[PDB]
A and B are shown apart, each in its own frame.
Chain A
Amino acid sequence: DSVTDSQKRREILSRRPSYRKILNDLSSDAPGVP
């Protein structure tokens, strides 16, 4: 499980309520204007 830590982790994100929330919301408007 520690070997495939990355793979096992990746699966969790797919069902992470807060991660998905912050992922969608925050990236919806990356600040960037000179």
Chain B
Amino acid sequence: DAGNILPSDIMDFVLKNTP
């Protein structure tokens, strides 16, 4: 494992978007 998870900020934006 070399960090397969993202920092919160990236996730925070993408979820805030919902097409």
Contacts and interface: CB of A to CB of B under 8 A. Distances in A.
Interface residues of A, number: 3
A27 interface: no
Interface in B1-19: 1
Chain A contact residues: helix, strand, loop or mixed: helix
A6 B1 CA distance: 7
Contacts of A9: 1
Interface string A1-34: 0000110010000000000000000000000000
B4 to A, nearest CB: 10
Interface of B: 1
3 contacts: A5-B1, A6-B1, A9-B1
